[PDB]
Every structure is written in C-alpha cells, then in structure tokens.
C-alpha cells in the first residue's frame, strides 16, 4: 500500500553540544541587530543544571582573565554556529527545569556581563515577575540554592540601605515557606577560608573582600549600615544586587550564605538558553512511488507544504578575521552538509528536496494508521517515534536503489 518517501528540508531537532562565537560590540566579532522567531506550539524540555553552556562560559572568561594579565565587562553574546539553534524559554514561572511552552528561537544570546561575585550576585538580569528559587533538588542538602530577585536593591561600597533589605528578606522567607514548612533563620558561615565566608567582588580594577557577616546574622538597621572591607579613602563601588546564593545545613531551619564555586554565577544568568542540533532528514509513508524551524510545531501537512527550496547553505560579520573557533564551526558544518548530501544522493534523490522511492512500507515499523500520520503528529514526535528503526530504513532504501 504505502511507500517510503524522503523529505530533506524538515524542521526536527535533537540535543547536542558544541562551541560558540563571542559576539561583542581574543574572540571579538561584530553583532548586528538580531531577531527572535516564535514557535506556534512546542513543549520543550529545558534543564539548566545539566546545561553545557556554563563550562564554555567559565573556560572563555578564564582565558580572558589570563589574556588581560577597569575590566569594563562588555555584555557578550554567544552566537550559535551554522546549522544549529538556540532555544529560549519565555515562561515566567520557570524553575530552570521541566517543560516550557512559550519557547522561541534566537540566533544570538542576550547580553551577559561576566562580573565575578559570590554570596551577592551583582549586575545580573532581574526576574520578570517575582523572586524565585532555583535548585536541582530541594531535598538534597549537598546542593546549593539560587535566589533570584525581582526588585533590585543598590549597595554602595560597604554601605547598604536597610529599609529595602528586610522587606526583601521578608518576601524571601514568605516564599520559602511555600517550599519549606518551617520558620527560617540566617547565620553567617564561619567557614574555613577567606573566599567561602566573606563577600568577594572587584571594582575599578581592584579586588574587594568585605565582611558581610552582619547582613544575615538576624536576631533593626533603620538606616544605612556600614560593613568592614579590606584589600573610607577608597574609590566607591555602588553596584546593584540582582540576586543571592543560599545554602542550607542539615525546627528553625537555617539558611547559609556561601555555596559553590564561580560556575554557579553563570548558572544564574545563562539558564534560559539551550543549544540544539538541527537534523534535516525525514522519512514518511505516502501513496507514491517511482524559515526553517519556523512552523516546527505545526502538523505534518503544514510543515511539509511550507517547505520550499532554499538558496543558502544549511552571517552576521562581513570580510572579518574569523579565528580558530569560527573556522572549526564552519568546517564542521560544511563537512556535515557534504556527508548528508552524499547520503541523500546515494538513492538518486540528489537535486529534489522531496523524493518518492520504491520500497514497501513494513507496517510493523510504526502501526499508526495513515490518517493520524499527517493530521495529528508533530514532525519532532514523528522523528522521536521512528528513531528506533531509522538505520534499517536507510539500509533498505540503499539496497532497493542498488537492486533497481
């Protein structure tokens, strides 16, 4: 009855990892005006904790520190190479993991200022609606906690205003009451060494290690409060607080400033983004034999018909020195396209995006009566279901083309 048909320009993606480009206006290409393409209906599984972006963040920023060895941290975008995509979850109650609905695609990330800090995140993008809690597992005491703020409070350094501080603490406690069912008190770390107990940052080209013990050892500021700090006859640092790092020990549960290493900082700002592989090759059953990622949530019929012939391979800069990573990405992309084109041409379906072939459709592959194939399933779901038997399908296609 039905026969296998090969589609090329298909919007289906999978999960993968790669390198990126350093959009910034060292790895310093340019950055034109970007654009964001919404998806009509895609339920996407996001996971910031497992994300591979933070590793690249840390490596590249460390290389920048070594190259420099007043920083003026430029908001640096990370641009995906050719053939890949970046997915952003726009939902406003997103715990950093799970399903997202309002999922959009963007070519280059939003600006990130790589300011190093701990126990007090400074110059970070605020929350859209309200303060929230990010954690891999609230019941695992070995994990850390990110508290994301909605109304930033400025700190001059240190000199901190207490009017907003205790209100923010009250809101934080009220929200944590939803997740943890006990009254919550705070207590300074009294940790091992300097970096895990004091507040750390840098301003105007010099480091600051400040005695931030007085901000959590609650038993009434009612005014500006001064904190000791060493390296007031110093240049001032009036950076704004965007969020805090919070940890628990072990019914007055105690929360604990401090937490993990520098990595978590970039987890507090680059959690909305995911890197995704595009795999343009699809197999479908049809009654015949002889832009991209835009409507990737539409029905099989709509996405099939919206497929038209492109005029480009698989773009921001112009006549610019690329660098090692850019050349890596471009060569890998062109090699992937060449391999895929040879694979498609092996069956003789070289020039045409859509190709019907002479292979009977073994009904045991998918069941799924023909009516529900092109009226109810998204392309990504179809690929996910057919992935069990793709290799056998490819081998049978090649064998049948060879037999003639």
């Amino acid at each position, epitope marked *: 009855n039905l026969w296998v048909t090969v589609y090329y320009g298909v919007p289906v993606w999978r999960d993968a990892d790669t390198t990126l480009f350093c959009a910034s206006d060292a790895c310093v290409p340019t950055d034109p005006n970007p654009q964001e393409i919404p998806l009509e*209906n895609v339920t996407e599984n996001f996971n910031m904790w497992k994300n591979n972006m933070v590793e690249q963040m840390q490596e590249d920023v460390i290389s920048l520190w070594d190259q420099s060895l007043s920083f003026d941290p430029i908001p640096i975008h990370y641009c995906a190479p050719a053939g890949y995509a970046i997915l952003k979850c726009n939902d406003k109650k997103f715990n950093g993991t799970g399903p997202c609905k309002n999922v959009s695609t963007v070519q280059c990330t939003h600006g990130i200022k790589p300011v190093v800090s701990t126990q007090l995140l400074l110059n970070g993008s605020l929350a859209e609606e309200e303060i929230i809690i990010r954690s891999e597992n609230l019941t695992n005491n070995a994990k850390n906690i990110i508290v994301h703020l909605n109304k930033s409070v400025s700190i001059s350094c240190c000199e901190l205003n207490g009017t907003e501080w205790n209100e923010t603490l009250n809101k934080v406690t009220e929200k944590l009451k939803e997740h943890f069912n006990k009254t919550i008190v705070f207590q300074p770390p009294s940790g091992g060494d300097l970096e895990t107990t004091m507040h750390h940052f840098n301003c105007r080209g010099e480091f600051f290690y400040c005695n931030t013990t007085k901000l959590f050892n609650t038993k009434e500021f009612n005014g500006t409060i001064i904190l000791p700090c060493r390296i007031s006859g110093i240049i001032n640092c009036t950076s704004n607080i965007t969020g805090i790092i919070l940890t628990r020990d072990g019914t007055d549960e105690t929360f604990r400033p401090g937490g993990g290493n520098i990595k978590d900082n970039w987890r507090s700002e680059l959690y909305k983004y995911k890197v995704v592989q595009i795999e343009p090759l699809g197999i479908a059953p049809t*009654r*015949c034999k002889r832009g991209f990622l835009g409507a990737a949530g*539409s029905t099989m019929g709509a996405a*099939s*018909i919206t497929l038209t012939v492109q005029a480009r391979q698989l773009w921001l800069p112009d006549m610019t020195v690329w660098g090692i990573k850019q050349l890596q990405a471009r060569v890998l992309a062109v090699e992937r396209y060449l391999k895929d084109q040879k694979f498609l041409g092996l069956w003789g379906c070289s020039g045409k995006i859509i190709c019907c072939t002479n292979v009977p459709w073994n009904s045991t592959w998918s069941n799924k009566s023909y009516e529900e194939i*092109w*009226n*109810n399933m998204t392309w990504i779901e179809w690929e996910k279901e057919i992935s069990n038997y793709t290799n056998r399908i490819y081998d049978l296609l090649t064998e049948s083309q060879n037999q003639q």
Partner: antibody
Amino acid sequence: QVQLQQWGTGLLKPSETLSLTCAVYGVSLRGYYWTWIRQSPKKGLEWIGEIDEIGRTKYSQSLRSRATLSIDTSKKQFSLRLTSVTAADMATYYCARWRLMMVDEVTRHGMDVWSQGTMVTVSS
Amino acid sequence: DIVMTQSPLSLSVAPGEAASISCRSTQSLLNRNGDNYLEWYLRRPGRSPQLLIYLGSERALGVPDRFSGSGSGRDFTLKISRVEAQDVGTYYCLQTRQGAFTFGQGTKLEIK
C-alpha cells in the same frame, strides 16, 4: 483544537459591495488553504475562492469577475469582496480550512475545520 | 465543467441498518498513482458540515468506523453499516480533479 469566526453585513440591497471578514483563532496560515463554500436553498453547495498564505489566489468560473480575496498576517484574517450582489446570488457563506499534503503534488485532504457560518440576506 | 449525480436523493432506512449511496461523475477520478480525488461530507440540519471521507478510503478524527466506500472512473459510492438516530441528515460527495470543484445534489437520510 482550532476555531474560526466571521463578521459581515445584515440586509444588503443589490448592486453594492459585499465584504466578509473571517478570522482564525488557532494554528497560523502558513500550512493550509482557506476556502469559502456557499450554501443556498437552491442548487446546493458551491465553491467560491481559495487563498494561500503568500497571496496566491484561485477562483471559480461562475464568479470569476465579481469576487476577490484578501489576506493579511498581523491578526490572521481573510476576506471576500463581492461586487454587485444580485437577487439570485443570496447564499450563506462558510469558511473552511483545507489540509494539504506534499507528494510530488498538492494532494488535497478533507476540509475538517469548518466555521460556524453566518446568515446573509438580500434587501429589496 | 464537472457535474455529479447522486443516487438516491432520499432513502428511508430502518434504524441500525446498512445503506449505500452512489454518485456518478463526468470524467475519470483517477490519479496517476493515487486512489481518487473525491470527498464525502455530512451535514446535520442547520449545523456546519464536517469531513467524513478523504481520498475515498480513510476517515477523519472522531469519525466512527461505520463510514466506508470506494469507486473508480465515473462511479463512486459510500456505505453505512450501522446508522443511528443522531446521523439523520444529509450526505454530499465532492469532486477535486479539475479546477472547477463542484458538489452533488444532496442525499437526505431519514429513518423509518
């Protein structure tokens, strides 16, 4: 699930312009056809027009020279404009969403998504 | 340019029984490799129509497996094995091969 809606006139006397607007509240216009069907107490169901999303249009021979079709993208509607409505052309109008399938040809499946329809009368 | 002819216009069948409708064309409704180019639709009295049969063989979502049929050339037919008091109404068959699409003359189904 997807739904359709319509807006139009009430009582219209002959020789004027009839303008009918039809809005879609579901999937975008990218991958379907939108087509108008007419039902009357006489001679049965007929065919009016077909529109893609790019703007490609197709019409019937009966009303080739009197009906035109328009679309937009900002708010996802489509529209009839029929000049010189006569007394014998009174007809309830229906919007519908043709599904399509690409196999070497635009193979046309059924028209599942049908608008609720609106009554149109003639003044005399 | 294309005219259908349905038969019968109206038949009265006892409830729960099987009935057959047949409509004729003026040209062969055969694709080069496909099945056909014909459509089958319901209409309840005073309500919007819905899809029944597309490409002459299959049925759409929510369609009970009581609607079937087939044909070729210049004759096609629809079949009901079991009819309900809910399905009293009208059936139409539609043509798509040439540009001038055209319905039929309506088939009214009424229970004894």
